[PDB]
Amino acid sequence: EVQLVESGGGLVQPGGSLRLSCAASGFNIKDTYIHWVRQAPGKGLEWVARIYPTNGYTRYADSVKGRFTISADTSKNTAYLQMNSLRAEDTAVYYCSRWFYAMDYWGQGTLVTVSSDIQMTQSPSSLSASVGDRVTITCRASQDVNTAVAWYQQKPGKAPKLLIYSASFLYSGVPSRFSGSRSGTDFTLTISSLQPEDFATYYCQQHYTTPPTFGQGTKVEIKGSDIVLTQSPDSLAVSLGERATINCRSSQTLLYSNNQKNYLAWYQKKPGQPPKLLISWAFTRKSGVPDRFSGSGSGTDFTLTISSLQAEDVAVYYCQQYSNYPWTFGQGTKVEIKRTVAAPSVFIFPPSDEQLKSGTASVKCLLNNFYPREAKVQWKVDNALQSGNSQESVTEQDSKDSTYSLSSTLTLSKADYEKHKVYACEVTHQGLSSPVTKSFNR
Amino acid sequence: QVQLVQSGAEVKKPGASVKVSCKASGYSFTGYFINWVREAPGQGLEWMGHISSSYATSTYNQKFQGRVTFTVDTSSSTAYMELSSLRSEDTAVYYCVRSGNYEEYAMDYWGQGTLVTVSSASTKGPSVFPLAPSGTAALGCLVKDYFPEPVTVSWNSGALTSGVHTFPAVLQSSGLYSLESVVTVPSSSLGTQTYICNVNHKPSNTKVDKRVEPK
Incomplete structure (x- = not known):
């Protein structure tokens, strides 16, 4: 079971140094090349370096020459990446992978955070599709790359997965609906009938020459509304x-x-x-x-x-x-x-003179221990049906008796509460054969 | 056990910014996603996004894109959510919740939640007014004009429990909150037993005791 495990990533202050390790399992690095590929926040995959453990042949990217060093210990079956004088530009997730010039196996990557020339052109940057749709992404090679093109899929929080190699060959385990093809320097990935697990970011890579180059990525997204x-x-x-x-x-x-x-x-x-x-x-x-x-x-x-x-x-x-x-x-x-009908018990509270000190009057009508929820409270002042100045609060259903209690507040300016002389609340409910009115004068 | 402990409640003025934290313990931090879910009054549950604890890169719900930023510090196994340009609509309980990357993917092991109240109002304790008593009689206490939530209301320092109905708080035009706590008791006992509502508003460290004698 081929396995690649990266380790050593962490917070490094600017101009700092750090070593990353890539432990290989189920195979020996002597038998292949090892690559370090990084991915900056929000951006695409960037190959930084490569080593052949057998003879220690090393190739770097111009971006990281002199600042990055790649080594290997075949005894330990481990690859290493030393980093010095790190820049803000270096912050990224660093994956290790291996080469069949395709990157078939990837570690899950390790985060390095700096706390401060073949080209592949992918089209389109974004794409919206629906389950069952036939999708086609393309990658134009900037020059002749004979059949040396692989296709990868990547979901957020995970490493890239090899999908296609040498431009039309299906990697072991990839489902049948995935295919890719070549026409000169035009390269195409195509999904027969989009499945719900195919929404991801897709990357073209040329494996013809070195350095391996990557397309900037094509994000495939749900068309229209979010899954409702x-x-x-x-x-x-x-x-x-x-x-x-x-x-x-x-x-x-x-x-x-x-x-x-x-x-x-x-x-x-x-x-x-x-x-x-x-x-x-x-x-x-x-x-x-x-x-x-x-x-x-x-x-x-x-x-x-x-x-x-x-x-x-x-x-x-x-x-x-x-x-x-x-x-x-x-x-x-x-x-x-659900329980039996329970008529509310109606109480009416006049404004405390203590509250009337405050300058506002709150008349409260309480409907206690009723079921069901539907209850209409209408306030009347001197038998004038009211509207517009009432708010109701409702309790959660009582655990034991399964009833509700409701408090309705008629709020008035103390002046207007002085104006009138009879205040009542009329309650309508399924348990009341006819509306029940409660009143007080002062 | 797996556990997520969130920072305490926050009060902010409109247009301000808030940073909520979520300390994780009991599992390998880097191996999971930290999601941020919110419950705003009457809006249900809403996924704002999640951050890979390993990559420190996030997927955001495009409804909050640009206003929400996720971060993690692995050195302290803590995840942070920073919401900027706060509006009154952002008043809500914000939960962090872990989700798996390898076998289990459902959001499990939630934090206790963080109440964030966005309002022009300032922290103030409540004015407690008695609702003098009306077979069974009803009496009450009105806890008015307090900010932020919440308020605890007990009767007789916990001795009186049966028949108590403390209603949910109402947000006034004032921007302050007010609730009522009523209780039903036998009318005859009105002259024998004494009733005191205890109101506690920890956000302002206010504590009030009020009697409701007959009017």
């Missing part, structure tokens, strides 16, 4: 101990064709607590989540199921996709306990 997840229903009410269902539909498939896994997760969100992961891969229950939670579905529709709802399951449930950027959430689904 729509949940149904928006709100749910089921009785204690009964089954609750929530569905989530994705505007595109979350199923990777290469591994048959759905990149969909289910989260619970209670006020004041961080989101709690319940399910990943669309059906795998997170260790420790109660049995009664389950997840099903695939492709574009998924379902979260609570086999028997409990008072502690009252929360907002969100579906979430981590298949492609930007990662998105569903709009959410409020689940609440």
Whole structure:
């Protein structure tokens, strides 16, 4: 199992020095060339240096001549990159790879941060496509590169992956939909039917001469809107101990064709607590989540199921996709306990004279311990129906009795509160055969 | 255990900038992504982006592109999120959350969250007003004009729990917050038992005790 592991990267002050190591495994560097290729923040892959361990032949890039040194210890099966008087321009992720003039194996790279001539022209810089689309990227060689062109794929946070070598040959394990072709100095990569796992940045490289050159990269992105997840229903009410269902539909498939896994997760969100992961891969229950939670579905529709709802399951449930950027959430689904109709108990509070000291009057109407949520509170002053100066607050559903409490505040300037003489709140609800009015005078 | 501990709550004026931190422990820092999720009142959950702990390079949600910057310091295993040009709409709870790169990819192991309140208002404690008592009677306490959130309300230093309803805070035109805390108690007890609401506003280190006797 060929493996390349980079190490030694870190924070180096300007004009500083640092050594990087590349430990090889499953093969011997004596048998091949070793390359150091760097990638600056936001930019493309840049070959910096190369060594043949057997005879210690070294080739550098003009960018790093005299500031970078590459060595190797065949005994240790390790390649090394010494760096001195480092510049701000040197900050980058440094990968080590190996050569079949293709870079088939890459380490996952190591970050170096400096705290202060064949050319390949890739087209286009950016590209927007949809799952199922046929995509074509191209790279114009600045001169004759006979068939010495490879194609690589790179996703954020990961090393490049060899896709095509010698311009039309499919690297072992690459899926059939990928192909590349050559027409003189025109080079083409083409994806038959875009799969959800193909959104990435693609790089052309010529392996004809040395230094190997790279195209600036073609980013393939989701066309149109971000992956949208729509949940149904928006709100749910089921009785204690009964089954609750929530569905989530994705505007595109979350199923990777290469591994048959759905990149969909289910989260619970209670006020004041961080989101709690319940399910990943669309059906795998997170260790420790109660049995009664389950997840099903695939492709574009998924379902979260609570086999028997409990008072502690009252929360907002969100579906979430981590298949492609930007990662998105569903709009959410409020689940609440369904119970019997409970008429509110209505109370009215006049402005404290202590508050009337402050210069404003707050008359409050309290609806206590009612169900369901729908409740209309209308304020009337001297039997004049009001509007426009009322705000309502609502409690979370009570765990034990499954009811709600509501507080409505009529706010007035103390002057206007002196003007009138009768204040009442009229409450309408399913538990009231007819509206119930509560009043006070002063 | 894997753990992410975030910095404390922040209050900022519109147009200001805020830096939130997320100290990670219990795992190999460089091997994972740190995502930043936000919950703004009534907006649900929103992914702003994530940073590779190894590369220090980020993928941003283009809705915040240019206003949000992720960084990491591996020497202290900490990730930072800096949001600039703060608006009132950025008032929200910001979570850091780890996500895997090799086998597990779902965002798991969340931080406790960081409340960031963006407003012209300044930190001030609440004015506590009694809501004098009206079979069962209702009485209350009005905690008014405090900034920022939150406020804790107890009754009889915790002795009285049953029948208590502390409503969620309301954001006034003032830009200050006000909430109500009511309780139902048997009418007859009104003259026997004494009721004191304890209000604690740690952001301003205010502590108030108020009695509600009949009017």
